[PDB]
Design a protein around this ligand. Structure first.
Ligand SMILES: *[C@@H]1O[C@H](CO)[C@@H](O)[C@H](O)[C@H]1NC(C)=O
Ligand SMILES: *[C@@H]1O[C@H](CO)[C@@H](O)[C@H](O)[C@H]1NC(C)=O
Ligand SMILES: *[C@@H]1O[C@H](CO)[C@@H](O)[C@H](O)[C@H]1NC(C)=O
Ligand SMILES: *[C@@H]1O[C@H](CO)[C@@H](O)[C@H](O)[C@H]1NC(C)=O
Ligand SMILES: *[C@](C)(O)CCC[N+](C)(C)C
Ligand SMILES: *[C@](C)(O)CCC[N+](C)(C)C
Ligand SMILES: CC(=O)CCC[N+](C)(C)C
Ligand SMILES: CC(=O)CCC[N+](C)(C)C
Ligand SMILES: [Cl-]
Ligand SMILES: [Cl-]
Ligand SMILES: [Cl-]
Ligand SMILES: [Cl-]
Lengths: 528, 532
């Protein structure tokens, strides 16, 4: 049947789904690994053992155990990111949307959710893959992976909790696509992995990791890169946090086995409740359990790998949004509120930069401050707000990504950069937040194409050209079909704006600030 | 007889000089100290001892021994600053212009020339005081002082070459004005001291030094302040340079006595020839022999003195010109030329910053570079040229002056700040140099009032209001004339920090003169350089 597919691990029965007055095939909750429960917690994923009979792939799977945001109960702005189904450690599944009739050897796109490595689900409404698969006629896959301690507790040396298992889960899902996508009409030789935030950082890390390189063809990174300051920690820092987690839960800390056995006896919510207690400083845009530079998944430091060109050489398409920092300021910085313009006093501004650059010394903080303060009008609350907004976005997303784009381009086979700066007309967040981190996703997934969501006609057209840029890129390595999106080159360094107005080409995206963040500040903190 | 005056040191005979269809009395070349020659070299000045008969004061005196600029032979733009009289170690004299008929007890203004403490003359044509004294009816005095090694060689400890003697020469001329100016019609209780560049730093130094404070009423500083990076050195650096001068002349360096004795046997031109070799690094806007923080003329560090209010509290009027650094870039920075647009390559831009901030470590250099570089267009020759111009101007003159003004105002009794940004219609220097360091002086001294000089009608008016501002300030401590119709020059307050532009257009009030860059130079950079 069109809905009955035999994979290498067993049979799966999909379901016919409606989409824009038509239909496509959907296979939800297909297991790609053995449930990482009990003694398998913190351990590398194990391939899913074959099963007899037909697997019911008609409904979404459980979401992985994670911290749940309850800042604004009932508010769709924050809740659209929360797990929309039962949470469970048995959460390693993937979803597939296939156009009907089933194509032959068509392009495949694999989505990797973000969420700072401490959260995220493959089942969110905004990640619904039916519109993109249909409109662009590609086989769209969305995977899952352990987040939080469950996926990144790192005790280098141990094989029970080596760290990076969340990334290894992602790899096993890609390995599964490599071996079974052909049975759903997909071409395993033309797979594009794409993700946002932590998902973008993940895509980037797979580009770097030798063990992942052969599992995909091209990549798309949205508002995230492997070198982001929050995306990874050293084995030493990973160990300290892991040990501090045990301490918080009164664990025997005599050895790794004792520490691990203790942590494995605790219930999921017990770990999550103290998850944030292991951070070394008071800060924002910083997460407890993230990937570790182990010398295994990551041969050597990310920078040395980027300078030597030790990574997959292919085509990449990446970009950022206009206001990457607002979301995190709102949750952890004084003076910010969801129900006000949020004019930031000078005192709160100071507090904010400290929170934004926890690792910096006083001289470093003075540098950031001077770099972002207009001394002809320092008591302007709006400028202090926008300034803090830029500080968080530039340091955590934009500049780290530009550093990545410039390094990759020297060895890559084609780079396409974008600057998404369109403010959705039906946004539920306040205006001061601007073009928020993660809100280009709804456009990438074609949400504007559904009338009921009340988007403007201009936004629908915008979403359509964005999906076509992504799809066309996925299948050829060029977002343009034979206004052309120019190729980012080391010399001209061009990029385009992504909004409802006719395309505009620019050069050197926020080069001034990024010179500060990528060269001066690092040098300053190293010398002092 | 207007021209015949008897001072505490003897009689003097002035001369009647014409001025704008009228006339005034001029007393030129009056001695105020003993010739600091022979064994006097490097030593503190000594009061001129009484003389008999009438001293002929109808001609300008000699200029002090100094380096002479021969970069552009025949070029007026540079030569107008060179000595226009014979040089000699016997140069401690002063000139005086007195309105005619002789006033009874009027306002006095004393001019202190600049020149980096290594040059300068009281006799230059641009300092001719007849126009100002005549138009504003004030008694105008022009003093002189030893420059270069002769006036600032410092070997702390010794009493033969203690340092700051050039500053002491200035003080002695002030002591003379205090004791004798009343005989020329001026009020010794109402003396304003004003100077440009090094002259400006000097005025600021007298405001600070306890030994100078009671010798004047108010002060005007033009493009210069005591805290400028080039205006002084530590006793240690002073000794280093002093010893380095001897080494450059095969002098016996076994002791101060022998070192000094050796340097005193040398001809003037001999010291001058190697003057520049004693500098720490290759640089621009840096001079070999300047005032030293000795603990005597200067009780403690200039900064601690400014923070504690340890200085004369009165009214001050100061400011800067739009393009303070162009003059120095032209002379010592690669890529600059008098006969070209001077578009600076990135390579030369880098070299210039190294030159402009010679005391900075690699980190400090990157900081400066980043602060003045538009990374969206880094190869723009013009932006690179102007960027260097701003770097040199902000670091050496503007920001140090803003630091001074903000600290002084916390204790002062009245601050007036200006921003001179008028490019004279008859400038001989190239367009890229803009409003040059020192070119506000011609307006201050009324040169625009003489037709043959070809200044525009609007420049004459500008000169007249500037002279009136200076004089009125000298007389009352406020450049504004009460209940007058003209726009008012507002006071500079720690809170509003107001200042006016000084040009041919109607007055404009602004606030926080170059705060952005000055916060960088006065707060951030020092912290960075202090780190390690
Ligand atoms: C698969 O599961 C869905 C939801 O639980 C159920 O409606 C459906 O009948 C199941 N498949 C069959 C027909 O066995
Ligand atoms: C990609 O590689 C091919 C051959 O390997 C080369 O012909 C092409 O120019 C490259 N494209 C870019 C823009 O690097
Ligand atoms: C003073 O010097 C001037 C200039 O040389 C001269 O004209 C005048 O006669 C001199 N006075 C006397 C009598 O010495
Ligand atoms: C200057 O001092 C006098 C006398 O104490 C005082 O009345 C006046 O307000 C002061 N003016 C300023 C501007 O400080
Ligand atoms: C990124 C750090 O992974 C943050 C992603 C945040 N959401 C809210 C868009 C999921
Ligand atoms: C100041 C450093 O003393 C420079 C004065 C230079 N002139 C050319 C205006 C005399
Ligand atoms: C955007 C987020 O929900 C940040 C996480 C908030 N806590 C630190 C309070 C858990
Ligand atoms: C500011 C000056 O004109 C510098 C004097 C010239 N040398 C350094 C070459 C002697
Ligand atoms: Cl629908
Ligand atoms: Cl639920
Ligand atoms: Cl290239
Ligand atoms: Cl300042």
């Amino acid at each position: 049947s069109e809905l009955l597919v035999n994979t290498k691990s067993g049979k799966v029965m999909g379901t016919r789904v409606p989409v824009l007055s038509s239909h496509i095939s959907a296979f939800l909750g297909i297991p790609f690994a053995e449930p990482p429960v009990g003694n398998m917690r913190f351990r590398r994923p194990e391939p899913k053992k074959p099963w007899s009979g037909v697997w019911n792939a008609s409904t979404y799977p459980n979401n992985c155990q994670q911290y749940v945001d309850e800042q604004f109960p009932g508010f769709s702005g924050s809740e659209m990111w929360n797990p929309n189904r039962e949470m469970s450690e048995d959460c390693l599944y993937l979803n597939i949307w296939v156009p009907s009739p089933r194509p032959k050897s068509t392009t495949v796109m694999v989505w990797i959710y973000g969420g700072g490595f401490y959260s995220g689900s493959s089942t969110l409404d905004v990640y619904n893959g039916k519109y993109l698969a249909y409109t662009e006629e590609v086989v769209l896959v969305s995977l899952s992976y352990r987040v939080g301690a469950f996926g990144f507790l790192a005790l280098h040396g141990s094989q029970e909790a080596p760290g990076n298992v969340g990334l290894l889960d992602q790899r096993m899902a890609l390995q599964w696509v490599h071996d079974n996508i052909q049975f759903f009409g997909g071409d395993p030789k033309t797979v594009t992995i794409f993700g946002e935030s932590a998902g973008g950082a993940s895509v980037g890390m797979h580009i770097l990791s030798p063990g992942s390189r052969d599992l995909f063809r091209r990549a798309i990174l949205q508002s995230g890169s492997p070198n982001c300051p929050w995306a990874s920690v050293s084995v030493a820092e990973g160990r300290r946090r892991a040990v501090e987690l045990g301490r918080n839960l009164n664990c025997n800390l005599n050895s790794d086995e004792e520490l691990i056995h203790c942590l494995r006896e605790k219930k999921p919510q017990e770990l999550i409740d103290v998850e944030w207690n292991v951070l070394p400083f008071d800060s924002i845009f910083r997460f407890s359990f993230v990937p570790v530079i182990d010398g295994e998944f990551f041969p050597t430091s990310l920078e040395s790998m980027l300078n030597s060109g030790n990574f997959k050489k292919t085509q990449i398409l990446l970009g950022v949004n206009k206001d990457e920092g607002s979301f995190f300021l709102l949750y952890g910085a004084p003076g910010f509120s969801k129900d006000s313009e949020s004019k930031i006093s000078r005192e709160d501004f100071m507090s904010g930069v400290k929170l934004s650059v926890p690792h910096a010394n006083d001289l470093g903080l003075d540098a950031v401050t001077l770099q972002y303060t207009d001394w002809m009008d320092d008591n302007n609350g709006i400028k202090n707000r926008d300034g803090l907004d830029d500080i968080v976005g530039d340091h955590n997303v934009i500049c780290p990504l530009m550093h990545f784009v410039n390094k990759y381009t020297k060895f890559g086979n084609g780079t396409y950069l974008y600057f998404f700066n369109h403010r959705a007309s039906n946004l539920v967040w306040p205006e001061w937040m601007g073009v928020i981190h993660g809100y280009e996703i709804e456009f990438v997934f074609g949400l504007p194409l559904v009338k009921e969501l009340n988007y403007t006609a201009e936004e629908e057209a915008l979403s359509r050209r964005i999906m076509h840029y992504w799809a066309t890129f996925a299948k050829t390595g060029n977002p343009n079909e034979p206004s052309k999106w120019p190729l980012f080159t080391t010399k001209e360094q061009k990029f385009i704006d992504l909004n409802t107005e006719p395309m505009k080409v620019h050069q050197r995206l926020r080069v001034q600030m990024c010179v500060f963040w990528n060269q001066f500040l690092p040098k300053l903190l190293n010398a002092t």
